[PDB]
């Protein structure tokens, strides 16, 4: 009963929208523009499927770009420690699976088995990638379908499957050069390509 009263008192407030934005990641200082994006990502969007089984995405992907030592990682750290389901990784993932799934087979007879990656483990959560601009070519290509169709299709020797990857990506990247150059456009300062750049809701 007490918590409900608190909830009602929250909605009745007229500054409520501003208060929530100012209450995200209080550790960081003076980045209200970013905080609004993170809050909107947590709430997400409505997930819809058409009358013929075509699925429309409802997850918000955010990319953050900045010079070294600008609290980029501090934003990812807050999200993983706060969001219900989340996974903190890096573009240069150590595991064999990487951001997507991979097939690994035990010694001799053992048939092939699927080893989950970052995007699979964060199902229905938020996947935070610390250095997007350093991803591997296999994952760079494989991220195309995961971000839009929300699946990972693998067809290897003896094993074929479609793996759910219904996750929202919150990435952090460094400029192609040492520092963000104000003269060039966002396209020039980033090593990403047009198909990926169109898959991010906010920058």
């Amino acid at each position: 009963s007490d918590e409900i009263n608190e909830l009602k008192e929250m909605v009745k407030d007229e500054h409520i929208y501003d208060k929530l934005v100012r209450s995200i990641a209080p550790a960081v200082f003076g980045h209200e523009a970013v905080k609004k994006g993170i809050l909107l990502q947590m709430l997400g969007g409505v997930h819809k499927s058409t009358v013929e089984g075509i699925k429309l995405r409802g997850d918000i992907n955010i990319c953050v770009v900045g010079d070294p030592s600008t609290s980029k990682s501090q934003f990812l750290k807050y999200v993983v420690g706060f969001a219900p389901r989340s996974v903190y990784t890096s573009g240069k993932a150590s595991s064999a699976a990487g951001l997507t799934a991979a097939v690994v087979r035990d010694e001799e007879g053992g048939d092939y088995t699927i080893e989950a990656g970052a995007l699979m483990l964060a199902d229905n959560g938020i996947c935070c990638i610390d250095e997007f601009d350093k991803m591997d070519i296999s994952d760079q290509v494989a991220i195309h379908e995961a971000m839009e169709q929300q699946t990972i299709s693998i067809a290897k020797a003896g094993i074929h499957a479609t793996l759910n990857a219904r996750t929202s990506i919150l990435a952090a990247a460094n400029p192609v050069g040492g520092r963000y150059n104000r003269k060039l456009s966002l396209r020039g300062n980033l090593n990403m390509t047009a198909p990926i750049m169109s898959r991010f809701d906010l920058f």
Binding site: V11, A33, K36, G37, L202
Partner: peptide
């Protein structure tokens, strides 16, 4: 916490997209 999207929200979402260009 509203169940109907008003144009004021559409305008707000438009602003965020512009700042990302």
């Amino acid at each position: 916490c509203v169940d109907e999207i008003t144009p004021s929200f559409i305008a707000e979402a438009y602003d965020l997209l512009r700042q990302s260009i």
